[PDB]
Short mmCIF file of C-alpha atoms and ligand atoms in Angstrom, two decimals:
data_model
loop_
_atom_site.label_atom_id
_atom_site.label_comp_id
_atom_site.label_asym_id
_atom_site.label_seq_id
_atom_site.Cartn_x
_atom_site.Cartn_y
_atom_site.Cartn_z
CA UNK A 176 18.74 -12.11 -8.79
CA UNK A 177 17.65 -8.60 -10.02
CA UNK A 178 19.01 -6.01 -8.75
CA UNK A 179 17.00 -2.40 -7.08
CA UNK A 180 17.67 1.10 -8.46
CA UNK A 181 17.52 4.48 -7.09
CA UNK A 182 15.82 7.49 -8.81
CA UNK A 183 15.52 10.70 -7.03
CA UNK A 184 11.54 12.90 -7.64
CA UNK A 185 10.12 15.61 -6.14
CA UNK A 186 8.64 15.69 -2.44
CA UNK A 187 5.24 14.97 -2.05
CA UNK A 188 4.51 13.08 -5.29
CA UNK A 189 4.88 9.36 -4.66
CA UNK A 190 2.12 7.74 -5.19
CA UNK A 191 1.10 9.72 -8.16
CA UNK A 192 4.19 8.55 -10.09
CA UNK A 193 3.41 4.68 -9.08
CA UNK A 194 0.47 5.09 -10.60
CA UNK A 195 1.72 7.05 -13.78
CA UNK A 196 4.05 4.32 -14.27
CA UNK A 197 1.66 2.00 -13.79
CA UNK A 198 -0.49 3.18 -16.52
CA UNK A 199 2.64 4.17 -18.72
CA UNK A 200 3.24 0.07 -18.20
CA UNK A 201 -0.11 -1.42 -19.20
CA UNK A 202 -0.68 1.10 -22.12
CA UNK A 203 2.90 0.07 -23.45
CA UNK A 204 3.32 -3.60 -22.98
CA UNK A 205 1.73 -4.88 -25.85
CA UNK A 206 4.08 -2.58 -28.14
CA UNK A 207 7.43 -2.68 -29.69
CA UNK A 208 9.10 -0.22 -26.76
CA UNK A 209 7.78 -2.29 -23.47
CA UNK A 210 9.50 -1.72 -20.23
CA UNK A 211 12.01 -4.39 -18.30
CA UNK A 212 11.14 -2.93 -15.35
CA UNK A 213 10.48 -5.24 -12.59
CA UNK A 214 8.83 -3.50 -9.59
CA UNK A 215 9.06 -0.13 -7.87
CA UNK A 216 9.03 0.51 -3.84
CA UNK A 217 7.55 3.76 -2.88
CA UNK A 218 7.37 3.82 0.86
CA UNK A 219 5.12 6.09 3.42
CA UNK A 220 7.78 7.07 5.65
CA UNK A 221 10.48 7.92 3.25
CA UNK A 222 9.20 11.48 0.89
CA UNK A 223 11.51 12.77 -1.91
CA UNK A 224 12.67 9.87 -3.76
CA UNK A 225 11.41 6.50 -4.68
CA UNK A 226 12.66 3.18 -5.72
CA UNK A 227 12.80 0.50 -8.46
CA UNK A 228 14.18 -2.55 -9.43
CA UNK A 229 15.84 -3.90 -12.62
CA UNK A 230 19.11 -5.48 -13.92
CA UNK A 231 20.96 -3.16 -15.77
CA UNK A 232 20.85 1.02 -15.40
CA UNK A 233 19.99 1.21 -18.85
CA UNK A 234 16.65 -0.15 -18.20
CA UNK A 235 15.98 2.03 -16.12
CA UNK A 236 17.27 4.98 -17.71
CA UNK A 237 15.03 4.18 -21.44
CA UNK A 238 11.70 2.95 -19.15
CA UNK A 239 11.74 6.55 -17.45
CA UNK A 240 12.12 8.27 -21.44
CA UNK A 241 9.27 11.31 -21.75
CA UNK A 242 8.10 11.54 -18.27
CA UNK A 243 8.06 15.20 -16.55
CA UNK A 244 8.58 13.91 -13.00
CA UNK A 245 11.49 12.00 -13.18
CA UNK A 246 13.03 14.68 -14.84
CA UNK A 247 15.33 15.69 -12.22
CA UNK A 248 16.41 12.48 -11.27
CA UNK A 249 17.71 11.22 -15.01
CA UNK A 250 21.13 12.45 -15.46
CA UNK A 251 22.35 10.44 -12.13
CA UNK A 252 21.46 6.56 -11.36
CA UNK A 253 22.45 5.09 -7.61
CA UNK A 254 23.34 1.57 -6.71
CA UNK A 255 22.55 0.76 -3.42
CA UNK A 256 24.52 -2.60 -1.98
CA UNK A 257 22.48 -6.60 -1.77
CA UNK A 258 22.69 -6.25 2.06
CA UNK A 259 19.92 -3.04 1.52
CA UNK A 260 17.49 -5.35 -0.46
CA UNK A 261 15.42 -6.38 2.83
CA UNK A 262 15.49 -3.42 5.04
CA UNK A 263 13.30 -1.23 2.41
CA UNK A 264 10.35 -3.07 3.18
CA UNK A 265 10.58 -2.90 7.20
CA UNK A 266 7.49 -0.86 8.68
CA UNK A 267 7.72 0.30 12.48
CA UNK A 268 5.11 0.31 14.59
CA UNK A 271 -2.06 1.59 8.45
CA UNK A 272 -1.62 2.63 12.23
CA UNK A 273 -5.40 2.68 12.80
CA UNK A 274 -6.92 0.08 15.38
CA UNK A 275 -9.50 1.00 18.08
CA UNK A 276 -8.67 1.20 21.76
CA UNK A 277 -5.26 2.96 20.96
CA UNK A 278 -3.53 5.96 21.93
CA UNK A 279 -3.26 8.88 19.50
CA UNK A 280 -2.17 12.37 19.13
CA UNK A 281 -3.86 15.65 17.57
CA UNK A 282 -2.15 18.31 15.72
CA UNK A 283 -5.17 21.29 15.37
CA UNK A 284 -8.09 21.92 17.84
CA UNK A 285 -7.40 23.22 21.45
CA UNK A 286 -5.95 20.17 22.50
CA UNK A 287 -2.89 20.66 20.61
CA UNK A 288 0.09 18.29 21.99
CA UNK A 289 -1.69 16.02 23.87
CA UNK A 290 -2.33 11.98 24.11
CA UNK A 291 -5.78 10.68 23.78
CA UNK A 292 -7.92 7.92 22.92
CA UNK A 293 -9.62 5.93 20.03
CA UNK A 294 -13.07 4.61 20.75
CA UNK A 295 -15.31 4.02 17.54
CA UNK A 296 -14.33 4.41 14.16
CA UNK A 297 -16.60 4.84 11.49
CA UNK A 298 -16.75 2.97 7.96
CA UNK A 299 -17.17 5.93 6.18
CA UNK A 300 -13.73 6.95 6.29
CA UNK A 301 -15.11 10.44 7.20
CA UNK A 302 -15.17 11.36 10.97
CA UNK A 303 -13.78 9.46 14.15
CA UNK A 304 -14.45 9.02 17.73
CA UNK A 305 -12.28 10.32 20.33
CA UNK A 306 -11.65 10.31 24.31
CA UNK A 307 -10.38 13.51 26.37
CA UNK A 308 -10.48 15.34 29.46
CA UNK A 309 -12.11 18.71 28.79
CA UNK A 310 -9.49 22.09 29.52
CA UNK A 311 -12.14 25.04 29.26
CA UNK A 312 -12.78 26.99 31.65
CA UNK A 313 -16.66 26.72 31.84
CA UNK A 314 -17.48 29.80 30.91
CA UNK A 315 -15.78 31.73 34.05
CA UNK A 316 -13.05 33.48 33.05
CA UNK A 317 -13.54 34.80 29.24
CA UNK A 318 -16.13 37.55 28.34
CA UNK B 6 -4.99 -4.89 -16.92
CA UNK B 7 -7.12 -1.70 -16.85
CA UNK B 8 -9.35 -3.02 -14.40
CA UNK B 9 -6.88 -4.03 -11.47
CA UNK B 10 -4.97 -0.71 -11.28
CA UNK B 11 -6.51 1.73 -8.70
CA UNK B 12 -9.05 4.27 -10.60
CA UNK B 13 -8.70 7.22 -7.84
CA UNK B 14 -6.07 7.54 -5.47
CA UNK B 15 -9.06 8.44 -2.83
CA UNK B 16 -11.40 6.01 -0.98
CA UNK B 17 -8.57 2.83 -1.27
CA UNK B 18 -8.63 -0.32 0.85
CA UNK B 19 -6.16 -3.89 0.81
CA UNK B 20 -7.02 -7.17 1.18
CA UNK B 21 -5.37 -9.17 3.63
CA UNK B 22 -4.91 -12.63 2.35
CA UNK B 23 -3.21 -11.68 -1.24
CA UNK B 24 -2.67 -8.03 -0.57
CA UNK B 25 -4.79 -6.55 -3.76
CA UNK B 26 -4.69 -2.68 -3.63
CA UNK B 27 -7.57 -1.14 -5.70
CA UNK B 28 -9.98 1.31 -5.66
CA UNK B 29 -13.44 0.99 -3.24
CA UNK B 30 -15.48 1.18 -6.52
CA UNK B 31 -13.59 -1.99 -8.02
CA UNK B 32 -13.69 -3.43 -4.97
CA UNK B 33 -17.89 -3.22 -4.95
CA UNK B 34 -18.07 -3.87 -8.83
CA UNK B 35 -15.19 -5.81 -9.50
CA UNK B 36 -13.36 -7.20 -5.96
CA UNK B 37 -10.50 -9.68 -5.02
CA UNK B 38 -9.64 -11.22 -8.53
CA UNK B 39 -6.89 -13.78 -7.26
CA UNK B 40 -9.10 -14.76 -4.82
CA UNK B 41 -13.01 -14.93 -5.56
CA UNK B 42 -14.50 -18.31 -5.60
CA UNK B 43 -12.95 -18.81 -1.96
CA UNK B 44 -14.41 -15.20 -0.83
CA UNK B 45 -17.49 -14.43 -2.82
CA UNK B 46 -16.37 -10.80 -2.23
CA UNK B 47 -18.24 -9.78 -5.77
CA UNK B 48 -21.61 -8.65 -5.49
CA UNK B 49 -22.16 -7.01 -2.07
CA UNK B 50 -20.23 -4.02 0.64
CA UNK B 51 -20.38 -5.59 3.72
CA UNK B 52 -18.37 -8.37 3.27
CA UNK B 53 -15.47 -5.76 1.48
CA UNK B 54 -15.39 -3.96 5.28
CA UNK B 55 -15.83 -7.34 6.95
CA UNK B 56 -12.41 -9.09 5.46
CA UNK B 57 -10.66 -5.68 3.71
CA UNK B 58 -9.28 -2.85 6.19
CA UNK B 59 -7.77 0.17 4.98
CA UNK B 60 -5.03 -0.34 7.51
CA UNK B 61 -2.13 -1.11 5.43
CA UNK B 62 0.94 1.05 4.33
CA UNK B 63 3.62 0.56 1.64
CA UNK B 64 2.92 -0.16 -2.13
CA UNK B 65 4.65 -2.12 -5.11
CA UNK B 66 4.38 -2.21 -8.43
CA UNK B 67 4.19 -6.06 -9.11
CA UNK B 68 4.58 -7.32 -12.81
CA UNK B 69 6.52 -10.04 -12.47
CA UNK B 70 5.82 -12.28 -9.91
CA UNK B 71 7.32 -15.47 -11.83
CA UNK B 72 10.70 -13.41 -11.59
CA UNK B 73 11.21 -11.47 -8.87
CA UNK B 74 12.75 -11.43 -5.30
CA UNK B 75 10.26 -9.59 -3.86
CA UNK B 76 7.33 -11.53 -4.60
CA UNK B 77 9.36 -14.46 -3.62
CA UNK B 78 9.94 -12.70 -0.04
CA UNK B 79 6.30 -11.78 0.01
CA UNK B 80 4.74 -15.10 -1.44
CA UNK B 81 2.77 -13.49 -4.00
CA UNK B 82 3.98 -15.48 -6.66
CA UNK B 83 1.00 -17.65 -7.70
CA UNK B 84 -0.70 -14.06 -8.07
CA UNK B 85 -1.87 -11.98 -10.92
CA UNK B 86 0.07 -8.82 -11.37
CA UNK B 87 -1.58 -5.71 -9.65
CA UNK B 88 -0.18 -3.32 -6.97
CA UNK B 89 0.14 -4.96 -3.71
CA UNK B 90 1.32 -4.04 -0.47
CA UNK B 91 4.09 -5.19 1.98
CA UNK B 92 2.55 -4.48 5.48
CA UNK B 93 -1.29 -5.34 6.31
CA UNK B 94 -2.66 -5.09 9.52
CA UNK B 95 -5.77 -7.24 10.51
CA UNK B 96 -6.92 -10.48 11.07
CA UNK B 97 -10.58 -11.95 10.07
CA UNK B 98 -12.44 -13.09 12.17
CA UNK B 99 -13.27 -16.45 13.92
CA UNK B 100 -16.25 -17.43 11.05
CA UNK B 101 -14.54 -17.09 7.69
CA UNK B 102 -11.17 -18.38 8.39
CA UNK B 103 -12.25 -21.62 9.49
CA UNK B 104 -13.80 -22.57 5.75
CA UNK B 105 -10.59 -21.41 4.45
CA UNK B 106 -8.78 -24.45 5.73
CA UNK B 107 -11.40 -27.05 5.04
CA UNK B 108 -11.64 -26.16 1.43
CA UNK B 109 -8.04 -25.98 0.99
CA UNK B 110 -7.04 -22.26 1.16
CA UNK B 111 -3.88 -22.20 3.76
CA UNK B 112 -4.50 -18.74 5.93
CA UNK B 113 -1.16 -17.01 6.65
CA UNK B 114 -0.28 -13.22 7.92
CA UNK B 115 0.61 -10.70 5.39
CA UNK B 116 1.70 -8.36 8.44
CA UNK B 117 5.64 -8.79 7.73
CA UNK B 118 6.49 -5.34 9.62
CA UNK B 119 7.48 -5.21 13.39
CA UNK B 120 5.87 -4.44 16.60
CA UNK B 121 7.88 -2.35 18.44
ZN1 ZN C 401 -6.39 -11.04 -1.18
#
């Protein structure tokens, strides 16, 4: 079975680079220089480093030739053991379904548990359910 | 090919019986490629909200499904290569999965994460 590498990148950029090595992929498949490169796992929780799978190192190490991003993490190639090869995928417990409890980080209500009621389609704006904490207009000027 | 891989990182939604990762434009022009003539997805918007939800997380670079664990672990060989997912959350509802199984299309959940 193939075996998964580990290449360190910068924080933040994750899904940028899947992409860029997606398109470095298709444009040079049909060429003399393609890549052995199998897949590459590039999960939401985890930010700062990103995964990819392949037999040898040396794959790896002549696939990731020219790009700017994986610059850093060239010079040093991690093997992580078989027993790791299942517990990259796990997700705990997307994270958008109506009639659930969630948090807010700006606002007033800063801290605080509420609840979804109606999302929209438009990936734009969403509902929300809370107790009101002003004053009503008693106290302030 | 150029016309599977996501066009703008923005405005992205999964499918939930092969896991196809794209771009809402391809989806509207283009839509589910390893699955059409059992979805008749092409062609229209509401039926890309009806059976796509953009609740998902995780993505992989698939290439080679013919040789490779994790498609094996995620039954996506019998796919064309694209950028999948491993975790989406959803289920249709109770008026297009019951076609599914009379024309031969075996319905399973993609949702491999945990609850709780
Ligand atoms: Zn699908």
């Amino acid at each position: 079975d193939p075996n998964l590498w580990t290449v360190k990148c910068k924080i933040g950029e994750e899904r940028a680079t899947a992409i860029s090595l997606m398109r470095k992929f298709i444009a040079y498949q049909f060429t003399d220089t393609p890549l052995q490169i199998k897949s590459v796992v590039a999960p939401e929780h985890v930010k700062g480093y990103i995964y990819v799978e392949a037999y040898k190192q040396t794959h790896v190490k002549q696939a990731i030739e020219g790009v700017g991003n994986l610059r850093l993490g060239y010079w040093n190639q991690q093997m992580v053991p078989i027993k790791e090869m299942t517990d990259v995928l796990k997700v705990v417990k997307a994270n958008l379904k109506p009639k659930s409890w969630v948090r807010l980080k700006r606002g007033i209500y800063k801290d605080d548990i509420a609840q979804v009621d109606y999302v929209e389609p438009s990936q734009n704006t969403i509902s929300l359910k809370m107790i009101p904490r002003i004053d009503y207009d008693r106290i302030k000027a | 090919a150029l016309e599977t891989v996501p066009k703008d990182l923005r405005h992205l939604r999964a499918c939930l019986l092969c896991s196809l990762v794209k771009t809402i434009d391809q989806f509207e022009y283009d839509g589910c490629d390893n699955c059409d003539a059992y979805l008749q997805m092409k062609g229209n918007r509401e039926m890309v909200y009806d059976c796509t939800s953009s609740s998902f997380d995780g993505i992989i670079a698939m290439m080679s499904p013919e040789d490779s664990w994790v498609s094996k672990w995620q039954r996506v060989s019998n796919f064309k290569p694209g950028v999948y997912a491993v975790s989406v959350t959803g289920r249709l509802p109770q008026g297009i999965v019951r076609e599914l199984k009379s024309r031969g299309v075996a319905y399973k959940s993609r949702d491999t994460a945990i609850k709780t």
